[PDB]
Design an enzyme around this catalytic site. Structure first.
Site, mmCIF file in Angstrom:
data_model
loop_
_atom_site.group_PDB
_atom_site.id
_atom_site.type_symbol
_atom_site.label_atom_id
_atom_site.label_comp_id
_atom_site.label_asym_id
_atom_site.label_seq_id
_atom_site.Cartn_x
_atom_site.Cartn_y
_atom_site.Cartn_z
ATOM 1 N N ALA A 52 64.316 30.416 1.310
ATOM 2 C CA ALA A 52 65.077 30.024 2.487
ATOM 3 C C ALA A 52 66.296 29.200 2.083
ATOM 4 C CB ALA A 52 64.204 29.204 3.438
ATOM 5 N N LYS A 53 67.285 29.166 2.967
ATOM 6 C CA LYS A 53 68.504 28.405 2.745
ATOM 7 C C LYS A 53 68.492 27.123 3.573
ATOM 8 C CE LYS A 53 71.300 32.450 1.624
ATOM 9 N NZ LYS A 53 72.444 33.270 2.076
ATOM 10 N N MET A 54 68.914 26.029 2.945
ATOM 11 C CA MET A 54 68.885 24.703 3.536
ATOM 12 C C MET A 54 70.302 24.159 3.682
ATOM 13 S SD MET A 54 66.753 21.454 2.127
ATOM 14 C CE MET A 54 66.642 19.904 3.019
ATOM 15 N N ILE A 61 73.304 21.790 3.403
ATOM 16 C CA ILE A 61 73.516 20.685 2.476
ATOM 17 C C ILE A 61 73.880 19.390 3.179
ATOM 18 C CG2 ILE A 61 74.015 22.205 0.544
ATOM 19 C CD1 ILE A 61 76.907 21.429 0.733
ATOM 20 N N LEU A 62 74.286 19.434 4.444
ATOM 21 C CA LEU A 62 74.542 18.237 5.226
ATOM 22 C C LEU A 62 73.551 18.198 6.385
ATOM 23 C CD1 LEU A 62 76.222 15.738 5.696
ATOM 24 C CD2 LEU A 62 77.973 17.166 6.623
ATOM 25 N N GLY A 63 72.853 17.079 6.527
ATOM 26 C CA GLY A 63 71.982 16.864 7.658
ATOM 27 C C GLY A 63 72.202 15.490 8.269
ATOM 28 N N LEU A 64 71.620 15.300 9.450
ATOM 29 C CA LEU A 64 71.677 14.037 10.175
ATOM 30 C C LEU A 64 70.400 13.239 9.925
ATOM 31 C CD1 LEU A 64 73.231 12.315 12.355
ATOM 32 C CD2 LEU A 64 71.631 13.332 14.007
ATOM 33 N N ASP A 73 66.973 15.297 9.643
ATOM 34 C CA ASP A 73 65.928 14.660 8.850
ATOM 35 C C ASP A 73 65.157 13.672 9.719
ATOM 36 O OD1 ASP A 73 64.739 14.123 6.060
ATOM 37 O OD2 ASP A 73 65.127 12.115 6.885
ATOM 38 N N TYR A 89 59.276 6.961 11.704
ATOM 39 C CA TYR A 89 60.490 6.457 12.345
ATOM 40 C C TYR A 89 60.300 6.199 13.838
ATOM 41 C CZ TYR A 89 62.676 8.184 7.980
ATOM 42 O OH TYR A 89 62.981 8.495 6.669
ATOM 43 N N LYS A 132 58.127 14.421 7.640
ATOM 44 C CA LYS A 132 57.444 13.820 6.508
ATOM 45 C C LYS A 132 56.084 13.283 6.949
ATOM 46 C CE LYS A 132 62.025 12.095 5.115
ATOM 47 N NZ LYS A 132 62.546 11.592 6.424
ATOM 48 N N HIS A 190 55.927 11.807 2.289
ATOM 49 C CA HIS A 190 57.006 10.823 2.479
ATOM 50 C C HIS A 190 57.130 9.876 1.282
ATOM 51 C CE1 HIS A 190 59.185 8.483 5.909
ATOM 52 N NE2 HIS A 190 59.806 8.294 4.753
HETATM 53 N N1 LIG Z 1 62.535 9.671 2.357
HETATM 54 C C1 LIG Z 1 62.685 8.355 2.493
HETATM 55 O O1 LIG Z 1 61.880 7.534 2.037
HETATM 56 C C2 LIG Z 1 63.900 7.859 3.224
HETATM 57 C C3 LIG Z 1 64.306 6.539 3.080
HETATM 58 C C4 LIG Z 1 65.505 6.122 3.634
HETATM 59 C C5 LIG Z 1 66.266 7.012 4.364
HETATM 60 N N2 LIG Z 1 65.822 8.275 4.549
HETATM 61 C C6 LIG Z 1 66.597 9.244 5.409
HETATM 62 O O2 LIG Z 1 67.961 9.177 5.041
HETATM 63 C C7 LIG Z 1 68.761 8.850 6.197
HETATM 64 C C8 LIG Z 1 70.029 8.137 5.809
HETATM 65 O O3 LIG Z 1 69.732 6.879 5.170
HETATM 66 P P1 LIG Z 1 69.835 5.474 5.943
HETATM 67 O O4 LIG Z 1 69.563 5.643 7.392
HETATM 68 O O5 LIG Z 1 68.993 4.532 5.165
HETATM 69 O O6 LIG Z 1 71.348 4.993 5.743
HETATM 70 P P2 LIG Z 1 72.825 5.603 5.575
HETATM 71 O O7 LIG Z 1 72.863 6.978 6.121
HETATM 72 O O8 LIG Z 1 73.220 5.345 4.177
HETATM 73 O O9 LIG Z 1 73.649 4.567 6.473
HETATM 74 C C9 LIG Z 1 73.448 4.501 7.900
HETATM 75 C C10 LIG Z 1 74.319 3.382 8.410
HETATM 76 O O10 LIG Z 1 75.706 3.704 8.170
HETATM 77 C C11 LIG Z 1 76.434 3.628 9.381
HETATM 78 N N3 LIG Z 1 77.451 4.664 9.362
HETATM 79 C C12 LIG Z 1 77.238 6.014 9.484
HETATM 80 N N4 LIG Z 1 78.323 6.738 9.379
HETATM 81 C C13 LIG Z 1 79.323 5.802 9.177
HETATM 82 C C14 LIG Z 1 80.712 5.933 9.033
HETATM 83 N N5 LIG Z 1 81.345 7.117 9.052
HETATM 84 N N6 LIG Z 1 81.432 4.800 8.887
HETATM 85 C C15 LIG Z 1 80.796 3.622 8.876
HETATM 86 N N7 LIG Z 1 79.489 3.376 9.004
HETATM 87 C C16 LIG Z 1 78.802 4.518 9.162
HETATM 88 C C17 LIG Z 1 75.403 3.792 10.492
HETATM 89 O O11 LIG Z 1 75.861 3.146 11.697
HETATM 90 P P3 LIG Z 1 75.675 3.769 13.178
HETATM 91 O O12 LIG Z 1 74.374 4.560 13.189
HETATM 92 O O13 LIG Z 1 75.645 2.519 14.053
HETATM 93 O O14 LIG Z 1 76.891 4.636 13.433
HETATM 94 C C18 LIG Z 1 74.204 3.062 9.897
HETATM 95 O O15 LIG Z 1 74.327 1.652 10.041
HETATM 96 C C19 LIG Z 1 67.780 8.071 7.064
HETATM 97 O O16 LIG Z 1 68.212 7.893 8.404
HETATM 98 C C20 LIG Z 1 66.522 8.919 6.912
HETATM 99 O O17 LIG Z 1 66.683 10.083 7.721
HETATM 100 C C21 LIG Z 1 64.678 8.712 3.991
HETATM 101 O O1 LIG Z 2 60.471 5.110 4.094
HETATM 102 C C1 LIG Z 2 61.538 5.410 4.752
HETATM 103 O O2 LIG Z 2 61.868 6.551 5.070
HETATM 104 C C2 LIG Z 2 62.452 4.266 5.106
HETATM 105 O O3 LIG Z 2 61.793 3.003 5.091
HETATM 106 C C3 LIG Z 2 60.823 2.799 6.038
HETATM 107 C C4 LIG Z 2 60.922 3.329 7.312
HETATM 108 C C5 LIG Z 2 59.970 2.971 8.231
HETATM 109 F F1 LIG Z 2 60.075 3.478 9.489
HETATM 110 C C6 LIG Z 2 58.932 2.124 7.946
HETATM 111 C C7 LIG Z 2 58.834 1.622 6.660
HETATM 112 C C8 LIG Z 2 59.767 1.959 5.676
HETATM 113 C C9 LIG Z 2 59.511 1.447 4.292
HETATM 114 O O4 LIG Z 2 59.041 0.329 4.107
HETATM 115 N N1 LIG Z 2 59.779 2.277 3.282
HETATM 116 C C10 LIG Z 2 59.569 1.890 1.894
HETATM 117 C C11 LIG Z 2 58.225 2.281 1.323
HETATM 118 C C12 LIG Z 2 57.222 2.823 2.115
HETATM 119 C C13 LIG Z 2 56.003 3.192 1.566
HETATM 120 C C14 LIG Z 2 55.767 3.032 0.211
HETATM 121 C C15 LIG Z 2 56.779 2.498 -0.561
HETATM 122 N N2 LIG Z 2 56.576 2.359 -2.009
HETATM 123 O O5 LIG Z 2 57.460 1.832 -2.670
HETATM 124 O O6 LIG Z 2 55.547 2.799 -2.494
HETATM 125 C C16 LIG Z 2 57.994 2.115 -0.037
#
Ligand SMILES: NC(=O)c1ccc[n+]([C@@H]2O[C@H](COP(=O)([O-])OP(=O)(O)OC[C@H]3O[C@@H](n4cnc5c(N)ncnc54)[C@H](OP(=O)(O)O)[C@@H]3O)[C@@H](O)[C@H]2O)c1
Ligand SMILES: O=C(O)COc1cc(F)ccc1C(=O)NCc1cccc([N+](=O)[O-])c1
Length: 316
Positions: free
Chosen positions: A11-13, A15-18, A44, A49, A78, A111
């Site tokens: 499948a194709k993903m 490259i830019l998501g919200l 995403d 969340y 996740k 996750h």
């Molecule tokens: N898998 C994981 O463990 C994990 C962990 C962290 C994040 N994620 C995913 O990655 C996504 C992105 O990471 P993130 O939410 O940590 O942070 P981010 O996308 O690096 O930064 C979001 C912040 O930047 C601001 N912003 C967005 N576009 C902007 C622009 N053009 N100019 C200035 N400021 C801007 C947003 O403000 P406003 O919203 O107020 O506009 C918000 O405060 C998450 O939402 C989540 O879906 C996954």
């Molecule tokens: O994990 C994310 O996606 C962003 O961070 C969070 C978002 C939430 F809604 C709630 C918690 C976190 C958070 O603490 N996330 C960090 C985190 C979680 C679990 C395990 C670890 N670890 O280092 O093993 C780290």
């Protein structure tokens, strides 16, 4: 720059998501509606969340309006840490599907590699404040993820925040049925991840970069922390290209063959962040941005460092 990357499930993903972490429930429905209206086709999500119901309202409306077809969307969620046991995975996936209004996910990720004790609390604590682990390992959780593919609930499965030894553990799993399609990890100019990215790419695993803007709204931010969006060196590259700093920060991972998931709830920024397919960073720009690495993490997980499976002790 093509808009989609081919995964190892065929499948194709996009490259830019919200991104949707921290998007308030009263704002995320409009955010996702705007995103779809301005061209986003990948969202995403995660159960932890606490806003998947509201994301789903937006998806369902745009499908009903025929702004998009379901096959054109790429929806990611996740499995949270308190659902790693084999008997809880299907129900966790089905709750996410119900909330998102979907009959399948395009991609479902473990996750974090760390399993926690099941129950109502997302971070179950002992009386001394440590997170209570589960005794289910990444390999049995992976087998439960594979079942979801075989039941039609998800098109692809993957991992998130897995270090290279943890990725290797799954790739070496006895009886492995499906390889992980994606490893979603933190990545930006202050945490450039060269070692882990090359390992994953060499195995055909696509890397998604999270917190590409440095997560300025992260709840644990301190004033002393570095700030990508305010770094004059990055602002200078943006000025040279007549783009915003955020646009440079989003284009950067794209040119490394990564997927990237910037979060916003601000309509004008949602639109801005998508206008990244019309310029190119030079090789020199790319190497310059890579040079800013300082191994700085938005998501350091310091409250989880004794977990047998905490991912960030290893160099990578
Ligand atoms: N898998 C994981 O463990 C994990 C962990 C962290 C994040 N994620 C995913 O990655 C996504 C992105 O990471 P993130 O939410 O940590 O942070 P981010 O996308 O690096 O930064 C979001 C912040 O930047 C601001 N912003 C967005 N576009 C902007 C622009 N053009 N100019 C200035 N400021 C801007 C947003 O403000 P406003 O919203 O107020 O506009 C918000 O405060 C998450 O939402 C989540 O879906 C996954
Ligand atoms: O994990 C994310 O996606 C962003 O961070 C969070 C978002 C939430 F809604 C709630 C918690 C976190 C958070 O603490 N996330 C960090 C985190 C979680 C679990 C395990 C670890 N670890 O280092 O093993 C780290």
């Amino acid at each position: 720059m093509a808009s989609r990357i081919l995964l190892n499930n065929g499948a194709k993903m996009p490259i830019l998501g919200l991104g949707t972490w921290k998007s308030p429930p009263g704002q995320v429905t409009e955010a996702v509606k705007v995103a779809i209206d301005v061209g986003y086709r990948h969202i995403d999500c995660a159960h932890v969340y606490q806003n998947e119901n509201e994301v789903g309202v937006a998806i369902q409306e745009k499908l009903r309006e025929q702004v998009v077809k379901r096959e054109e969307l790429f929806i990611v969620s996740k499995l949270w840490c308190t659902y790693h046991e084999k008997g809880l995975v299907k129900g966790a996936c089905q709750k996410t599907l119900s909330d998102l209004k979907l009959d399948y996910l395009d991609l479902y990720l473990i996750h974090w590699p760390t399993g926690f004790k099941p129950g109502k609390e997302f971070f179950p604590l002992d009386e001394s404040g440590n997170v209570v682990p589960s005794d289910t390992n990444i390999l049995d959780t992976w087998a439960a993820m594979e079942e979801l593919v075989d039941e039609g609930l998800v098109k692809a499965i993957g991992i998130s925040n897995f270090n290279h030894l943890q990725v290797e553990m799954i790739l070496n799993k006895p009886g492995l049925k499906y390889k992980p399609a994606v490893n979603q990890i933190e990545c930006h100019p202050y945490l450039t991840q060269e070692k882990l990215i090359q390992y994953c790419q060499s195995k055909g695993i696509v890397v998604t970069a999270y917190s590409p803007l440095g997560s300025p709204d992260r709840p644990w931010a301190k004033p002393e922390d570095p700030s990508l969006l305010e770094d004059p060196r990055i602002k200078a590259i943006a000025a040279k290209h007549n783009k915003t700093t955020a646009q440079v920060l989003i284009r950067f991972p794209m040119q490394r063959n990564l997927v990237v998931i910037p979060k916003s709830v601000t309509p004008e920024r949602i639109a801005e962040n998508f206008k990244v397919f019309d310029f190119e960073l030079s090789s020199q720009d790319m190497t310059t941005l890579l040079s800013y690495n300082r191994n700085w993490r938005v998501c350091a997980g310091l409250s989880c460092t004794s977990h047998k499976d905490y991912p960030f002790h290893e160099e990578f």
